[PDB]
Amino acid sequence: ENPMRELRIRKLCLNICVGESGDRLTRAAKVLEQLTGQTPVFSKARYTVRSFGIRRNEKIAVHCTVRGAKAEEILEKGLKVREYELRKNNFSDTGNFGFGIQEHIDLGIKYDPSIGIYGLDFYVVLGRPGFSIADKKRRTGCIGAKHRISKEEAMRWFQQKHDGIILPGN
Amino acid sequence: TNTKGKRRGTRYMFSRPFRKHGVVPLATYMRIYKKGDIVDIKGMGTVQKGMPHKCYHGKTGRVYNVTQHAVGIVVNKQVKGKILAKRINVRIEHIKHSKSRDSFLKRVKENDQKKKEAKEKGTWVQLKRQPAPPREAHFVRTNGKEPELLEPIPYEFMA
Amino acid sequence: FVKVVKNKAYFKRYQVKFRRRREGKTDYYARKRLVIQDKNKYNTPKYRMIVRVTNRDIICQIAYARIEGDMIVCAAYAHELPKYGVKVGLTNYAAAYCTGLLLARRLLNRFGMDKIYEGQVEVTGDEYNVESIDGQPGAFTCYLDAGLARTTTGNKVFGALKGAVDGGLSIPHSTKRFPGYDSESKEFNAEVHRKHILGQNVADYMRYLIEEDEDAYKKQFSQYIKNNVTPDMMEEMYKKAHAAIRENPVYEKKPKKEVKKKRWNRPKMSLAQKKDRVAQKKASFLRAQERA
Amino acid sequence: GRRPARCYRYCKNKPYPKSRFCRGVPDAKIRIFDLGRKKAKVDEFPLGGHMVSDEYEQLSSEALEAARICANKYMVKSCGRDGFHMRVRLHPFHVIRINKMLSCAGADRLQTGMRGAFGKPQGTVARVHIGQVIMSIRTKLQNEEHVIEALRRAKFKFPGRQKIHISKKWGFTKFNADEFENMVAKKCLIPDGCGVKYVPNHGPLDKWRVLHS
Amino acid sequence: AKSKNHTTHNQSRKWHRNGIKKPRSQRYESLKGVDPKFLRNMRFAKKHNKKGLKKMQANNAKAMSARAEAIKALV
RNA sequence: GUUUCCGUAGUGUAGUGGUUAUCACGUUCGCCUAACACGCGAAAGGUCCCCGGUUCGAAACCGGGCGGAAACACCA
RNA sequence: GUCUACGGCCAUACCACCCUGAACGCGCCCGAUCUCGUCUGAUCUCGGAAGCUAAGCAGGGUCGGGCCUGGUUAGUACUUGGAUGGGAGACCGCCUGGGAAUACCGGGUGCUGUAGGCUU
RNA sequence: ACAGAAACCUCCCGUGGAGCAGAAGGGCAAAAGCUCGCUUGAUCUUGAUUUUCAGUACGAAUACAGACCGUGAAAGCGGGG
RNA sequence: UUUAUCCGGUAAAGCGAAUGAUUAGAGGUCUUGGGGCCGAAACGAUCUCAACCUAUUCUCAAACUUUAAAUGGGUAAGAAG
Numbered sequence A: 001e002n003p004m005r006e007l008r009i010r011k012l013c014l015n016i017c018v019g020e021s022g023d024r025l026t027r028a029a030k031v032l033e034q035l036t037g038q039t040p041v042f043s044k045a046r047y048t049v050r051s052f053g054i055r056r057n058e059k060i061a062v063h064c065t066v067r068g069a070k071a072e073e074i075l076e077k078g079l080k081v082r083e084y085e086l087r088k089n090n091f092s093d094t095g096n097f098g099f100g101i102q103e104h105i106d107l108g109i110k111y112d113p114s115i116g117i118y119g120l121d122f123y124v125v126l127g128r129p130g131f132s133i134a135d136k137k138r139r140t141g142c143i144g145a146k147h148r149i150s151k152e153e154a155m156r157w158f159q160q161k162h163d164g165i166i167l168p169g170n
Numbered sequence B: 001t002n003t004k005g006k007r008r009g010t011r012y013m014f015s016r017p018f019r020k021h022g023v024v025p026l027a028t029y030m031r032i033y034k035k036g037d038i039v040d041i042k043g044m045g046t047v048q049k050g051m052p053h054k055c056y057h058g059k060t061g062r063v064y065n066v067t068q069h070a071v072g073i074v075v076n077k078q079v080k081g082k083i084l085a086k087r088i089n090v091r092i093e094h095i096k097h098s099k100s101r102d103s104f105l106k107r108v109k110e111n112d113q114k115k116k117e118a119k120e121k122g123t124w125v126q127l128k129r130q131p132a133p134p135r136e137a138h139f140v141r142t143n144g145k146e147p148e149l150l151e152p153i154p155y156e157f158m159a
Numbered sequence C: 001f002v003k004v005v006k007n008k009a010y011f012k013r014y015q016v017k018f019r020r021r022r023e024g025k026t027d028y029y030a031r032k033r034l035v036i037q038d039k040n041k042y043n044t045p046k047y048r049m050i051v052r053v054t055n056r057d058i059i060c061q062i063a064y065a066r067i068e069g070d071m072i073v074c075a076a077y078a079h080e081l082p083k084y085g086v087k088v089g090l091t092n093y094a095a096a097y098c099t100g101l102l103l104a105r106r107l108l109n110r111f112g113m114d115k116i117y118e119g120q121v122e123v124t125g126d127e128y129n130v131e132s133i134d135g136q137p138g139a140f141t142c143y144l145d146a147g148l149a150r151t152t153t154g155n156k157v158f159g160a161l162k163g164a165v166d167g168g169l170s171i172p173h174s175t176k177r178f179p180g181y182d183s184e185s186k187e188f189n190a191e192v193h194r195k196h197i198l199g200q201n202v203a204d205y206m207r208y209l210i211e212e213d214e215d216a217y218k219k220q221f222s223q224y225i226k227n228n229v230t231p232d233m234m235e236e237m238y239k240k241a242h243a244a245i246r247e248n249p250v251y252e253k254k255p256k257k258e259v260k261k262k263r264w265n266r267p268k269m270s271l272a273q274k275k276d277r278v279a280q281k282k283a284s285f286l287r288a289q290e291r292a
Numbered sequence D: 001g002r003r004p005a006r007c008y009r010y011c012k013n014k015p016y017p018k019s020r021f022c023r024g025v026p027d028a029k030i031r032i033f034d035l036g037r038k039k040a041k042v043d044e045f046p047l048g049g050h051m052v053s054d055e056y057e058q059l060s061s062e063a064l065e066a067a068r069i070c071a072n073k074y075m076v077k078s079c080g081r082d083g084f085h086m087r088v089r090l091h092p093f094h095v096i097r098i099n100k101m102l103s104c105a106g107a108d109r110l111q112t113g114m115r116g117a118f119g120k121p122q123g124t125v126a127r128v129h130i131g132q133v134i135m136s137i138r139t140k141l142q143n144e145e146h147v148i149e150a151l152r153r154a155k156f157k158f159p160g161r162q163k164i165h166i167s168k169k170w171g172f173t174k175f176n177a178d179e180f181e182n183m184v185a186k187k188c189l190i191p192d193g194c195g196v197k198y199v200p201n202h203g204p205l206d207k208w209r210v211l212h213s
Numbered sequence E: 001a002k003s004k005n006h007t008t009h010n011q012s013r014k015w016h017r018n019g020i021k022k023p024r025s026q027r028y029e030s031l032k033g034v035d036p037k038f039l040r041n042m043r044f045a046k047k048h049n050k051k052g053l054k055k056m057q058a059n060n061a062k063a064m065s066a067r068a069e070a071i072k073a074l075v
Numbered sequence F: 001g002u003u004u005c006c007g008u009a010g011u012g013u014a015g016u017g018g019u020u021a022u023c024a025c026g027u028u029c030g031c032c033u034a035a036c037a038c039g040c041g042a043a044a045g046g047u048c049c050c051c052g053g054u055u056c057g058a059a060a061c062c063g064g065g066c067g068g069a070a071a072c073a074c075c076a
Numbered sequence G: 001g002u003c004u005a006c007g008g009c010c011a012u013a014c015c016a017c018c019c020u021g022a023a024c025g026c027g028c029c030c031g032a033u034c035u036c037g038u039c040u041g042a043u044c045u046c047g048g049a050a051g052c053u054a055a056g057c058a059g060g061g062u063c064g065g066g067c068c069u070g071g072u073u074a075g076u077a078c079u080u081g082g083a084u085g086g087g088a089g090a091c092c093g094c095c096u097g098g099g100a101a102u103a104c105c106g107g108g109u110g111c112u113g114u115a116g117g118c119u120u
Numbered sequence H: 001a002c003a004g005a006a007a008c009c010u011c012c013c014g015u016g017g018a019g020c021a022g023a024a025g026g027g028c029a030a031a032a033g034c035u036c037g038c039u040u041g042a043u044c045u046u047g048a049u050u051u052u053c054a055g056u057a058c059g060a061a062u063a064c065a066g067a068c069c070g071u072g073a074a075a076g077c078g079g080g081g
Numbered sequence I: 001u002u003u004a005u006c007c008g009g010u011a012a013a014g015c016g017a018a019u020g021a022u023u024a025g026a027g028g029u030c031u032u033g034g035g036g037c038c039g040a041a042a043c044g045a046u047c048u049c050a051a052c053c054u055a056u057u058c059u060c061a062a063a064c065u066u067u068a069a070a071u072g073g074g075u076a077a078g079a080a081g
Ligand SMILES: [Mg+2]
Pocket: C027, C030
């Protein structure tokens, strides 16, 4: 019997990196738009890199943060493609997790022969009531010792709701 | 020959001491200065506007002005003989109340008080200070010991 | 492994911030610029009206700043307002008015000025700005203190201000942030401040919610149902308050004496009592494993 | 090569550490300020024989080299190759200077005499105060004589004057020899290769829990 | 044709022989240097003093006859 | 010692202002030739001397150095 | 006893971890009718009040790191004046005064300013 | 995910190790670091002082005062950096 | 010359307090490596050397400093109070 340590999803982050700019990026923005239903933020280059074809302050990726129920509704319909199974080393040291997909169509999406197939990074920030203590402005603070989601609490999170196997071996 | 620049040799004066790098505690500009009050200059890095300068870092002078956030202050500065009583316009941050005067004031308040009293007696009280006299004949006593014998101790080479 | 960031060195060199910083409560730079009084004044104070909307209760108080610790001359909270016929919804912009109004009048009862610079009475929601009367005690003034509230248009803070201005303090306030300013035009409606002052925000939420769905009413505001408060009524609770406050602002306290006075913290352990616990162990340990 | 040590025997100048400020320093002659069985233990190797300066002087890097070597040669013989440690405790380190030799050709014509007098880096030297150690050695308690004389020969690569002294500490620790066996047997002191950790009645109790366990 | 490039040698001797006079400070030093808005004002204070002398004189004689009465009531 | 100047493909040498690198020669492969030359088509090849700094970035802009070069070293 | 609001001096206050929260507040919380702010009501604004001290905070704990004192090192190092002191010289000795710092041992762990609660 | 010592994202730590056109030097954090909105306080005008000192200039600075303004809910802050 | 009171960053010290150098061992697949040697290969065994860092230790800094003297520099010790 726990009061409100309802381990629950604070956010779902969708990034679509594509070291290009212009088209091949601008189209990727419509995928997140379509999938989420919110205008995604264009990221840009921290600084220039030569082997890559990217330049400081050039646009590269496009990314979103999805939250509330519509996070649940894209995590579910996310893993599904990864048939409710992940690996041991994605359950991270701070109680977050991450599962990437290969192709954006597999999430109930229509392919246009123009708008190709850019998968995406899904990651999710598990939280808990009273995790906004840090992020607020007045009377900020830190989140206890417990109240911090350990790797192994984030594991049997994912194992008792999406009921995945979480297969070992790296 | 060296550079005349206003802040030479200040590398390690104006430098704030330790673990005080930051917000200037507010008290230090919410105590009141007023003309006649004697004040010790003490330059400070943090604020650079209205700085004094090294040739009077650590001097004292009386105040002759008071502007919105600064204090015009008359200080004596020695210069190949002729000392010059001269006036500068230092921002509050670099200034304190010297407690120099404040032994006297407490000595005055006591003497006027001790003179008004013991006037109804007419007994003459020792008002002036007086330097530390020679320590008076006292006795000592050991009780039931002789004193302890010292010997200088034999040198051996430690390393 | 990694390098341990938090060495001995981390803590030999870590220089604390500056207490009311750690707690995270105070612009001091900005307290600096608010508070410290010019030195063409030496003693005379600088008053600031302090408003921080908490979360349950709005606190407003006039303070002046001394070297031992800023002294509060007058303090008016929101949880007083039951006295003045306002039971509920008392961290709400319209109650910050009454609170700030209270404050202005609890102050102005002292230095005997409740008979002058009343400010606006019927309430409009405009420029009211007090003009000191000649041959009288000149009006009171203070430079509003927001604290840490991102002061966008509509926020309660500079709204409670409107209360203390309306109540007869001469604060420099502009109108650019009162709920009503149009940020694509640059005027008032002012008749939006009408509402915004008297809580027909809350009335019209108490009416969009009700006809759509029941039991979101009651959930969203139970105590707005309980205490037999309604819309329509609302406007004419508050108007009894900015009247009732103004006929009697003064605080009467409540006298206090009883407490038995038990000590139900926990105390500091004395030296010897730590001194043994290590000697108490190490005899619990030694004994335990001189065996198995 | 270099002027004779004479001319840079004495500390006149303020330390010139090799740094940003002087650069192009020829690498110090000496490189190993310890040899023998530096893989020793504290508990098997009990004789902190010392060589100590009696004068405020400078010692060249190249003297230290010789001083070391000639003590590695006599010890070995004496004890064998395994049967000591030698430590030099003056890594030369303020940098010494040379006006650039007043170079001229034949009869010559112009040197400029003194302009830009400031020299260049020549080498490196140690500062040495009185009663300060230069070299130290450890062996078995057995083998005192064979330390004595090894440092004795080293004195002769080496200007001024300096006493050979035998210490009161466990070999290379600071802990006064009359006292280890006790301080170890009860664990004020815990073995740590060459040296030893002094462990006090200070830290968390679970640190202790590991000992006396 | 080289030479000396300073010294501050006998010197102490000189700028000291005649003394080093700690500047002779009068009472009533000049108000030049002070913020004009002081003086702008304290001159209206100083100028309109005499306006208010009738009070001053009578109010003096009140205290003088009250303290002629205080010292005489002691007698 | 001090004052200049260079260093870039296997070699001789261009080149830019801070996005990019050449020529000729050499060489590898075909062709033509009975076979070599010559001629004609294809080709691959350096951290732009070693460095640290600045900068989006340096072969190129600073500072240090290392190798190769040049020029002075006048009154006695 | 204790808290809140505003505070002073800024670690005896920090940090790391362990323990407990009666009431009021202080918090966590619930939502987007409006104001307002976002990619996202994640932060700010606002309207609330269905839960729980999960954390902050507060209260406590650690032969806990740190900071703050004491001791010790040590009358050591260093130094004002002093000598027709020693010493080939480096340097060293004394006389008259002043007199540090580490390692190593101890103790402590924030004091209070105004306004207002609660324990009636 | 592709993604590798380096693209992109998210959590944690992060007293200051960045950053603050430059030599260093001093200064700096819900700043003086970074991002955006609004702009001309780089504006007009007397005087006082500091610094270089002879306590002469220039340059550079500090305090005030008078106008006219930007900014900000406002206190102030701002006469180049 | 005292007594108050500021000011002060040199000698010394420390560097198990920041920066900068630097010896040594215990310790650590931290990392990682590049070589071995035993291993097809295997954080497999054992070596080894790099680099890092966990407790340590040697020795230093004019263009370092937690500390930090001696000698020194302001004021003040009243009728102008
Ligand atoms: Mg602000």
